[PDB]
Design a protein around this ligand. Sequence first.
Ligand SMILES: CO[C@@H]1[C@H](O)[C@H](n2cnc3c(=O)nc(N)[nH]c32)O[C@H]1COP(=O)(O)OP(=O)(O)OP(=O)(O)O
Ligand SMILES: [Zn+2]
Ligand SMILES: [Zn+2]
Ligand SMILES: [Zn+2]
Lengths: 49, 67, 257, 48, 44
Amino acid sequence: YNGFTGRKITSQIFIGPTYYQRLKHMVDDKIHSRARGPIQILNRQPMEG
Amino acid sequence: MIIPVRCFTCGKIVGNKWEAYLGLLQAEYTEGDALDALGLKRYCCRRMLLAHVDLIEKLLNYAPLEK
Amino acid sequence: PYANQPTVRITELTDENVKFIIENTDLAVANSIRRVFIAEVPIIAIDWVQIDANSSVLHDEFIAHRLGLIPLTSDDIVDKLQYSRDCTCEEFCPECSVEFTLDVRCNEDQTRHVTSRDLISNSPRVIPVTSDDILIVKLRKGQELRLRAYAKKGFGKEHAKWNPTAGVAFEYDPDNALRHTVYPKPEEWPKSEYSELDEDESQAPYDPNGKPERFYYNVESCGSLRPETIVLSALSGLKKKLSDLQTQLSHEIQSDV
Amino acid sequence: YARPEWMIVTVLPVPPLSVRPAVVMQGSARNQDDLTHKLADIVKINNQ
Amino acid sequence: MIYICGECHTENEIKSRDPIRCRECGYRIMYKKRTKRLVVFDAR
RNA sequence: UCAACUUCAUG
Ligand SMILES: CO[C@@H]1[C@H](O)[C@H](n2cnc3c(=O)nc(N)[nH]c32)O[C@H]1COP(=O)(O)OP(=O)(O)OP(=O)(O)O
Ligand SMILES: [Zn+2]
Ligand SMILES: [Zn+2]
Ligand SMILES: [Zn+2]
């Protein structure tokens, strides 16, 4: 049954208990942004990482 | 690590049923019959007890940092 | 041009369950009543935890999580209690919250099962649905858990800890006569418990003029609120949301004029 | 712009310190660039 | 501060610039011990 | 708040 409207979904949906794993890759570890931050000595270009 | 309070899918309290489940398993009851005796009806709640691994007992073997 | 008059028939009433049928109502109204059951019925649950000492294996925020999920009796005073935002006093006070305390130490050799029974409330009306018990943590000898908690009014839209219900079963058209679900092979499909069809007939004949009515509900209580009062509070809360909407609408219409 | 004799190295250009920065650790020590070490070797051999 | 011993679990008070050795057991691993200030946890 | 190197992962 559709959660928002309550109407039965016309196509019957495949449901069951499946085992799922949470991989170590998480968005908080990957989000990054740069704006005139630290700069390397030799190249005098923005740093890496 | 320890039996979750409340089934994830619906929210029925399953935290109070682990010790009773283990006792019923010791009695003779099959896993399904014990789950029925505890009142777990939907397969979402039965997954909570059936698939639970109680690691808190293994962690309690290590001695506490402060005694 | 006006609202239909709904009718209710309660089939089952037990301390944990209410099975009822609402007839002559719209699908939207019925679904939103179910939605309010799940998300917009106020309840009392722990939302502030301060752990003085936690030497248990579980970390502090794990303990706080488990304490928040513990149901608390909220039958009468949840309507009296105010939200923390509404209360004039800074932080929390008897009117906006309830205080619990836990002081457990495993002095004995045998493992001590800290349960919801060990939580002690300052007001007798809120108790952790103890009258087994929910296991907060297991303590080895020499391990101690001491904490103070404050429980506040809230509803399930904020957090699932405030859900007053376990599973709301909602069904309409038990025998498919509006063809809202089109079975590829109707015979393979199990009959509903509310189905009135004979065993030979898999589906009722298509009703071209039909509209979803006679909705069947089974509301299971989590123990915090009685299953009857979950439904009554949901109806009242939906009515209050509509009335607030109407007040704001009238004010803005007056402003436009 | 280029005479064949100028190809043979009689004067070795020593790059500025910007080209070969001094690599500082904790103020306790200053490692030197590979170019600085190679130039030190060249100076030693030239003096010998 | 006061450091709890790793092995014998007895609090010992070690001044700054002092070797990290528990009295009466000699273990060289100490732990800083929980803070007096209290942190609020939302049960969520 | 350095730099080289390696390895391991992500597309
Ligand atoms: C579809 O093409 C992409 C891109 O070409 C880019 N890519 C990825 N790895 C590399 C690499 O090593 N070097 C370069 N240059 N590009 C690379 O990744 C390719 C696919 O790889 P995949 O086949 O694993 O994608 P699934 O089919 O596996 O997707 P699921 O169902 O998991 O989501
Ligand atoms: Zn469940
Ligand atoms: Zn207050
Ligand atoms: Zn020691």
